[PDB]
Amino acid sequence: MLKEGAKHFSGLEEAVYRNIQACKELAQTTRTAYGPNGMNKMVINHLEKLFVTNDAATILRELEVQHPAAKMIVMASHMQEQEVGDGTNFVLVFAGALLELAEELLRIGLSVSEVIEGYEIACRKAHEILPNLVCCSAKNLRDIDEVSSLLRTSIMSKQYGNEVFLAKLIAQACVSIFPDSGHFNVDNIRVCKILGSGISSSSVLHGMVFKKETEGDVTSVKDAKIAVYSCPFDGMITETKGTVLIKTAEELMNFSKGEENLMDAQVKAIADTGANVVVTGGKVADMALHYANKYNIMLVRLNSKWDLRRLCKTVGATALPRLTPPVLEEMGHCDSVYLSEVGDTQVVVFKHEKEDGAISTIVLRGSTDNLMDDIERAVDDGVNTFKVLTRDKRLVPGGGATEIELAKQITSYGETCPGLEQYAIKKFAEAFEAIPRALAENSGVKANEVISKLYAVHQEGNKNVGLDIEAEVPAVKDMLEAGILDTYLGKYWAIKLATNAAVTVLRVDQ
Amino acid sequence: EVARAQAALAVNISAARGLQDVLRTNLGPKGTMKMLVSGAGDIKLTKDGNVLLHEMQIQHPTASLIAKVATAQDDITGDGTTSNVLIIGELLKQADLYISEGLHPRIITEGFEAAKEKALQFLEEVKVSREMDRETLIDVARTSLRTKVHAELADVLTEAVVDSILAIKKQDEPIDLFMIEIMEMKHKSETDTSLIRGLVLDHGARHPDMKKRVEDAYILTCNVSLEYEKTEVNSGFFYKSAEEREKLVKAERKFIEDRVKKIIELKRKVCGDSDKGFVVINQKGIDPFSLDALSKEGIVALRRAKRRNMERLTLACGGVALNSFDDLSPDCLGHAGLVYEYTLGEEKFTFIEKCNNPRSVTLLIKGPNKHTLTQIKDAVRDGLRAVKNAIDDGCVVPGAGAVEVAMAEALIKHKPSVKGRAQLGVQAFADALLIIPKVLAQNSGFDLQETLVKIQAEHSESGQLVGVDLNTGEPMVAAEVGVWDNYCVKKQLLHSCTVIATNILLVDEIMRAG
Amino acid sequence: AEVARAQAALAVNISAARGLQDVLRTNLGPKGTMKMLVSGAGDIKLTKDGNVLLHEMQIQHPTASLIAKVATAQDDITGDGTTSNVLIIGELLKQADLYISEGLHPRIITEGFEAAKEKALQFLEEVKVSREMDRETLIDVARTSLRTKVHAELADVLTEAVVDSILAIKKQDEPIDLFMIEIMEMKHKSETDTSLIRGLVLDHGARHPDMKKRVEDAYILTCNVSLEYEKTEVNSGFFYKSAEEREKLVKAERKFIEDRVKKIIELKRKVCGDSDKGFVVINQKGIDPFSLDALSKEGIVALRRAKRRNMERLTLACGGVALNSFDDLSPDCLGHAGLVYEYTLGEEKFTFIEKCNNPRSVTLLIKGPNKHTLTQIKDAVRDGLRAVKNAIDDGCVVPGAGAVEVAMAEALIKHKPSVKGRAQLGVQAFADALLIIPKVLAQNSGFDLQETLVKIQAEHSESGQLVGVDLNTGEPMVAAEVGVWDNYCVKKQLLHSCTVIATNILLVDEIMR
């Protein structure tokens, strides 16, 4: 400060300006990133590799700002993304939008608590009236449509057109195997992206899909006792002496054969422990391969940790470098453990089917990684939006036909509840228009034009914005029934969530 | 360099001001929490007077001096410390004028004294003897909690706060020493906070279903493992020589089952019946088969326990820490009235609860484990001090600075000196008092002006302690409000503010030393 | 365009005013000092008086325009305390600024001044009493009136002569004296000396031993148009344009000269008798060379250069009337003061017209060789004459020496403005502005302006004590008992003139350049 002491970068103006303004910075694109999104975002992640998406959290985590303002709220956006797969595209914009009313009320001179608390009780009032606007509930996981109907909404809230083949393909991955009652799992259903085939060739093989080359034979048994190992081959040939191969002419003789019998004992000890599939994040060797061909134990030549991880995760396997006779601790899990060609890529396939614990493994055949990973992104955040763990998701208008109802609900009521809080309560019903704007953003019209008509749709729950021109000229697309609703819950959090950090990040002048 | 005479204090006055502004709301539920980046480079949020000081790396000597002196009071109260910064420099803002009018800072330091004493006298005359009712404790707890966190957050947490202190006064302890154990726990939300009259261990060892649900818990806290090692060489014995390794291979696996079946004995020694779950608790690891050989018998063995727990468990259960197992009666291994290993997330947090003489009450908070959950970890222990202070003093008054006016009124209304020299100081003295309640109101709402001339005329009308409504900005009876100044709390700021202002108000030469 | 507005704009104002007033703290009372002012004339102007200093040479300020009104106003309505007013207002502003530094509205600070003044007004109405208009009771005030304006040693040597002039009244109702001020000045061997003369003195006379040195029965013929003309209240036209007109001009003028001097000498015989009384000719213009010694030897005293102010004071003082002319006329019209005495002091011939039918005109002969001294003392006489008259015009006199200012500050005891707290500040700001004079003296004296002042209040709060800082040693004493008294009309008028400008300050939040 004035004094050489007082560590801080936040406060006073730079709070009522820069913090909120820095909060404004990132919500800018989240607008283009939520609901139907025609917008796209190049990102290099410190691979210098471009990637394209509409999602903030993928990007924001990378982005580094002086100020915890940005650094905090993402956690809530994560806290959403943790609990709810999508809407996080939205979860940031409303707070940042709702915030900047304060700095205005600060120019209008409204106190911290005064500005805060109006949003609060209105947020409770929201949390009171928000479930009143539950317009449906989900029903059946076994039904593909009942699932896929919703799933578009989040895929929509990532990317618009693709959602159709996708949402179906998702419940066709059997979101249904899990009850979605107190349980559901990504890693069991895990996306596995095959570069090649088509992007709409993205398929479903229930049970593990490992793009890794499937070696040896097929597993000794399909129940396979599965000993997965980080690097069970560090080489059994040693790299030593002169040439980084040999030094003395007598050296080479012992280098070549030693790999064999060690790996022979190693792959015998794979059979000795009884592993019916051998998984080497370490190298593949033809002898060991032929040993794995002799002992008939299916071989995995190379592993991402994700391989080992999931194998460690799902099978109950434990990946360990073995220069060491393998010992089954990993043991088995999956009742059918296969070789397969999916995308006609050699696909390491383990499968076991259980109401909980079943791997129903999303296999994305795809033409482009940079797409198929963003194609993964929406289905990810779509099935994570499928993750509610209420089979009946108490659905509310998806793509936000809600806000117009609530923008009507609160600020009207907002004045009824009196005192300067009312203005914060009335400011509360404003930033609803964000996604109606944020779609009209990527749709290309004015939120006023939107809201004026979508106030003129009055009590609806249905008509609202979207993509194309029906979010433009009428600003009317049925966001109850385009087939698009959203769960009350993912909605319920964003208000609740974006209530907290927004309220919070204002309070802090240091 | 030298900042000479008036200049040296001109530095002192300034460094007080801008920080006082931060704390005009660091205080009350109106009080605004403040965050720290450059204090570390971490993302850090805190509300409290002294801690924020230490958290920041504070280059300015004044602040650098203050963090130490406000500590001693922040040691005791924890609230009123977020208050304390105001009155001090504000008094500088008072007196500097008088020396700017011209006068000795001497006579004003002098002048503060008798005013401090009448205050101290008034502090007696004001302090309201109040009872130990948990209600009376709640409002003292929550007012500090309300100061430090949301009144809601104050409310929801207040119960467990005023609860443990009852069991720590069950010890007839005048203060809070144990039952200070706080536990942050993996959760999506900091919403969840629980009051464990006993303790909580975080581990079930590594083995589930040991009869980990334990109604009758005879607590073996054993800092020695049942896991010494399953391999050839001992736990601390390492050998790269060959012949010495073949020596330990045989009995290393044995000395486990030595200690294992000691417990297997100790189980039947303690119990004779698997019915009562016998709780083994290890500061270090325990072998799976050790657990297995124990778990099957119904022995619940815990490993990797914490030394404070070991301390706590020894004390709370009437428990014992042991370097051996052998055989012992149930009571030789202290008793927990209830023990339940509780899995949340992955980790199974053993609830060892209502230990015999549950001398340590674990206050468990389930949250995101952010500094947000740390942000509520303070007000509690802070409020603990406050109720401990309220436990300390039966004499507690309305908060919200109702005392300030009634101080500033009487102390100024009469000349305690019937002099200039002291009254000059006295004038400045009791003036810096009112800074807090008016600015609180002024920060809340109605300006310093009305609330004062309210509360003054009100006190003038009353003599009741009437104090600001921090959600209104005009006074109420803070006895009725619940915001309550412990005489233990409120007294020490009079010490600090004066005693700090004494020598710092007298400096002329200042220089780099060394 | 370029506009200064609101809070930051009024700063320069209150920075100026409070900054401009603090220099006058060197003034107001004998422990304060005469302040030296210099002009483009290079004149060293030594006045502890605010007005003199204020309206002559200063630094450009927007407040410099407004302050020039009030020290004039208090000089106008009193003649005293023009130095007083200035130090109160910024002291109130310094107070007021704090509350505005508190952000509390200049409007809410403005609107609280007025009751507070009324309070003190009513209070100064309470602490006033009707005192004597007695010369000695005026000395009590004259000592006090002069010192807070002019110097004490001057005050003392002025105290007797100042009162004597304003005591010479017929019981006029005038708060200041028009004709009791007749100021004769001189280059002396005393840089400061003042003679006290009742009646009128002439600017210049003409003294001859032929003329009567002492005219006891004085029929004063006081004339503008002079001896060079003949039965004329109006001068006669000259033509130097041509030769033959000028040729006839210089011959007949002596007839205008002769008849005129004849007009007096035959009229002295008529009016004053032959040698029986003394005669007085006043020539407000030059005196003819023939008529000079001719009026001289006839018993007539012809007086060269009496003013038009001598003209009017004489008529009023001596009860006669000044003429334009020397023509034969009754003695009564011709001015008669029971003494005409031409007193030549220095190089200047001062003709007393004394034993005047009205001692309305009374004269003070100032002395100094040094003009700055002649400036000071000649200026030092007037304020008291105006001030101390406010004691002898008014049956009431307010007690001085700041004893009454400590008296209201507590008598302003607060939450008496329980109204809002803006008036409570308006009184709280005002209670402190009262004390700036009791401050500035103990200030200008030893010890503390405060430690004594709080003694004063701690004392004054004690019963029976209206007590105040000494104007000299700065020590506590009861002021009304010392007789130290500022004029009654000062305070009540002072408070109004004090508060209004400071009130005007807060209503101006905008200044446009």
UniProtKB/Swiss-Prot annotation, chain A:
Covalent link (Glycyl lysine isopeptide (Lys-Gly) (interchain with G-Cter in SUMO2)) residue numbers: K211, K241, K247
Modified residues (Phosphoserine): S10, S149, S200, S256, S304
Keywords for this protein: Acetylation, ATP-binding, Cell projection, Chaperone, Cilium, Cytoplasm, Cytoskeleton, Hydrolase, Isopeptide bond, Nucleotide-binding, Phosphoprotein, Ubl conjugation
Keyword presence, Nucleotidyltransferase: no
Modified residues (Phosphotyrosine): Y17, Y492
Ligand binding (ADP): Y34, G35, G87, T88, N89, F90, M156, S157, K158, G399, D486
Pfam family, one: Cpn60_TCP1
GO molecular function: ATP binding; ATP hydrolysis activity; ATP-dependent protein folding chaperone; cadherin binding; protein folding chaperone; unfolded protein binding
Cross-link Glycyl lysine isopeptide (Lys-Gly) (interchain with G-Cter in SUMO1) placement: K446
Top EC class for this record: hydrolase
Post-translational modification N6-acetyllysine, affected residues: K305, K387, K453
Single GO biological process annotation from the record: positive regulation of telomere maintenance via telomerase
GO cellular component: azurophil granule lumen; cell body; centrosome; chaperonin-containing T-complex; cilium; cytoplasm; cytosol; extracellular exosome
Record-listed Mg(2+) binding positions: D86
Entry's EC annotation: 3.6.1.-
Binding site for ATP: G87, T88, N89, S157, K158, G399, D486, K491
NCBIfam families: chap_CCT_theta (TIGR02346)
Disease annotated for this entry: De novo genetic variants in nearly every subunit of the TRiC complex, including CCT8, have been found in individuals with a broad spectrum of brain malformations, and clinical phenotypes ranging from mild to severe epilepsy, developmental delay, intellectual disability, ataxia, and other features of cerebral malfunction.
Function of the protein: Component of the chaperonin-containing T-complex (TRiC), a molecular chaperone complex that assists the folding of actin, tubulin and other proteins upon ATP hydrolysis. The TRiC complex mediates the folding of WRAP53/TCAB1, thereby regulating telomere maintenance. As part of the TRiC complex may play a role in the assembly of BBSome, a complex involved in ciliogenesis regulating transports vesicles to the cilia.
Subunit structure: Component of the chaperonin-containing T-complex (TRiC), a hexadecamer composed of two identical back-to-back stacked rings enclosing a protein folding chamber. Each ring is made up of eight different subunits: TCP1/CCT1, CCT2, CCT3, CCT4, CCT5, CCT6A/CCT6, CCT7, CCT8. Interacts with PACRG. Interacts with DNAAF4. Interacts with synaptic plasticity regulator PANTS.
Family to which this protein belongs: Belongs to the TCP-1 chaperonin family.
Name used for this protein in its record: T-complex protein 1 subunit theta
UniProtKB/Swiss-Prot annotation, chain B:
Residues recorded as bearing Phosphoserine in the entry: S194
Family: Belongs to the TCP-1 chaperonin family.
GO BP: any one term: positive regulation of establishment of protein localization to telomere
Disease: De novo genetic variants in nearly every subunit of the TRiC complex, including CCT6A, have been found in individuals with a broad spectrum of brain malformations, and clinical phenotypes ranging from mild to severe epilepsy, developmental delay, intellectual disability, ataxia, and other features of cerebral malfunction.
Positions annotated to bind Mg(2+): D79
GO CC annotation, single: microtubule
Species this protein is from: Homo sapiens (Human)
Positions bearing the Glycyl lysine isopeptide (Lys-Gly) (interchain with G-Cter in SUMO2) cross-link: K240
Subunit structure: Component of the chaperonin-containing T-complex (TRiC), a hexadecamer composed of two identical back-to-back stacked rings enclosing a protein folding chamber. Each ring is made up of eight different subunits: TCP1/CCT1, CCT2, CCT3, CCT4, CCT5, CCT6A/CCT6, CCT7, CCT8. Interacts with PACRG.
Broad class of the protein's primary localization: cytoplasm
Domain of life: Eukaryota
Purpose of the protein: Component of the chaperonin-containing T-complex (TRiC), a molecular chaperone complex that assists the folding of actin, tubulin and other proteins upon ATP hydrolysis. The TRiC complex mediates the folding of WRAP53/TCAB1, thereby regulating telomere maintenance.
Protein's name in the database: T-complex protein 1 subunit zeta
SUPFAM superfamilies (UniProt xref): GroEL apical domain-like (SSF52029), GroEL equatorial domain-like (SSF48592), GroEL-intermediate domain like (SSF54849)
The UniProt record lists the keyword Ribosomal protein: no
